[PDB]
């Protein structure tokens, strides 16, 4: 039993809710919140900008030190950093950004990072400003993640479309 509330069950291990991931993180304080990161961990907009703003820029400060030491992530890769006031840990995962021309096949690799964590609160990777089709992202999630994932979808209209079209 866990504290996630109001989710629709899609499969054995995937759950979905119309929610603001920032507000959901603030209330649940999950072990892991996933950030929709880029390779430079520059948290300017989308989910990343919102999560970072909620940490009063502490996520960005920590991220800049990470990059200065380790260099950029790979598209499809991830790193574990602090969850600050939102979660125990933040798993920064880089899905391909279609608006930069990155290969969508890397979306499966991106979701594979979730399998290293038993339970996660997450957005749909490569959705929103990353330019991928969220219906495809949900399909890849369901067919790749085997651990327990709670997906927060900010847009109510999109949420209803994802549920109604789910196979
Ligand atoms: O005030 S807001 O419209 C800003 C938004 C931030 N929270 C999100 N939650 C889940 N997926 C998301 N994708 C992009 C943002 C987002 C609530």
Curated annotation (Swiss-Prot):
It is a multi-pass membrane protein. It is found in: Host endoplasmic reticulum membrane. Coiled coil: none annotated. Changing residue 164 to L: In strain: Gamma/P.1. Residues 1-167 form the Macro domain. It catalyses: Thiol-dependent hydrolysis of ester, thioester, amide, peptide and isopeptide bonds formed by the C-terminal Gly of ubiquitin (a 76-residue protein attached to proteins as an intracellular targeting signal). Inhibited in vitro by GRL-0617. Changing residue 31 to A: In strain: Mu/B.1.621. Responsible for the cleavages located at the N-terminus of the replicase polyprotein. Participates together with nsp4 in the assembly of virally-induced cytoplasmic double-membrane vesicles necessary for viral replication. Antagonizes innate immune induction of type I interferon by blocking the phosphorylation, dimerization and subsequent nuclear translocation of host IRF3. Also prevents host NF-kappa-B signaling. In addition, PL-PRO possesses a deubiquitinating/deISGylating activity and processes both 'Lys-48'- and 'Lys-63'-linked polyubiquitin chains from cellular substrates. May form homohexamers. Interacts with N protein. This is Papain-like protease nsp3. It comes from Severe acute respiratory syndrome coronavirus 2. The gene is rep.
């Amino acid at each position: 039993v866990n504290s996630f509330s109001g989710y629709l069950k899609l499969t054995d291990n995937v759950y979905i809710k119309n929610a603001d991931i920032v507000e959901e993180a603030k209330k649940v304080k999950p072990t892991v919140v996933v950030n929709a990161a880029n390779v430079y961990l520059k948290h300017g907009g989308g989910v990343a900008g919102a999560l970072n703003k909620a940490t009063n820029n502490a996520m960005q400060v920590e991220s800049d030190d990470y990059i200065a030491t380790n260099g950029p992530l790979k598209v499809g890769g991830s790193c574990v950093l602090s969850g600050h006031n939102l979660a125990k840990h933040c798993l920064h995962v880089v899905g391909p950004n279609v608006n930069k021309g990155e290969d969508i096949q890397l979306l499966k690799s991106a979701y594979e990072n979730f399998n290293q964590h038993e339970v996660l609160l997450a957005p749909l990777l490569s959705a929103g400003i990353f330019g991928a089709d969220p219906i495809h992202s949900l399909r890849v999630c369901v067919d790749t993640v085997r651990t327990n994932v709670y997906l927060a979808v900010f847009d109510k209209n999109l949420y209803d479309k994802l549920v109604s079209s789910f196979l």
